[PDB]
Amino acid sequence: GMSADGSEYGRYFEQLQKVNLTVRLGDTGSFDGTAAITSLKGSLAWLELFGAEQPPPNTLSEGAEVSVSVWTGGALCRCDGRVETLRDDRQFAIRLVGRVRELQRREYF
Numbered sequence: 001g002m003s004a005d006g007s008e009y010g011r012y013f014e015q016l017q018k019v020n021l022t023v024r025l026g027d028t029g030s031f032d033g034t035a036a037i038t039s040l041k042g043s044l045a046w047l048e049l050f051g052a053e054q055p056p057p058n059t060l061s062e063g064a065e066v067s068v069s070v071w072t073g074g075a076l077c078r079c080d081g082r083v084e085t086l087r088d089d090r091q092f093a094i095r096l097v098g099r100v101r102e103l104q105r106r107e108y109f
Contacts, residue, residue, distance in 0.1 A: 006042030075102035
């Protein structure tokens with residue numbers, strides 16, 4: 001039902017799994033962190049950082065383009081996204097867009 005649903009995202013992402021957080025910092029650089037999920041509802045997840053390595057103030061925003069990455073048993077499933085609705089410098093949503101492809105695959109021979 002129309003409640004910002006998902007498709008196959010929860011085949012790769014999970015409610016307690018963790019994701020990279022590549023934030024384009026258009027004025028600064030990038031800020032590329034880690035957070036665990038706490039709640040996953042289709043295209044939407046909610047996050048809690050991983051540690052005291054947190055961004056500068058005023059810098060995160062609710063529609064920052066941010067890109068996620070998680071490993072699930074075969075490749076790197078990464079997805080571009082937006083923040084959707086921030087809550088704090090360490091607690092925030094994300095909304096997956098552009099589908100999740102197997103971009104990377106731990107190139108170790």
